[PDB]
Amino acid sequence: TLINQHILKPAPPPTEIPARLQVKPPQPAAMKIPNRPTLLGGSAI
Amino acid sequence: SDYERLMLLLSDRFMRLRFVEAWRKK
Numbered sequence: 001t002l003i004n005q006h007i008l009k010p011a012p013p014p015t016e017i018p019a020r021l022q023v024k025p026p027q028p029a030a031m032k033i034p035n036r037p038t039l040l041g042g043s044a045i
Numbered sequence: 046s047d048y049e050r051l052m053l054l055l056s057d058r059f060m061r062l063r064f065v066e067a068w069r070k071k
Contacts, residue, residue: 021055021057023056023057023058
């Protein structure tokens, strides 16, 4: 058995839209291998 | 050549060998 936590309350944190772009075709393309951990949400044009 | 200038939008287009040839010497 295990005793579990609970969700608190509707708390709203919105994200924001950053500005840069990238081209680089290698797998790391940043600091490490996976990409959806290291890609900025939704970027501005 | 403004077709190529349109077809290249958002393209934006040996130092790490230097810092490893010293450590391969050591």
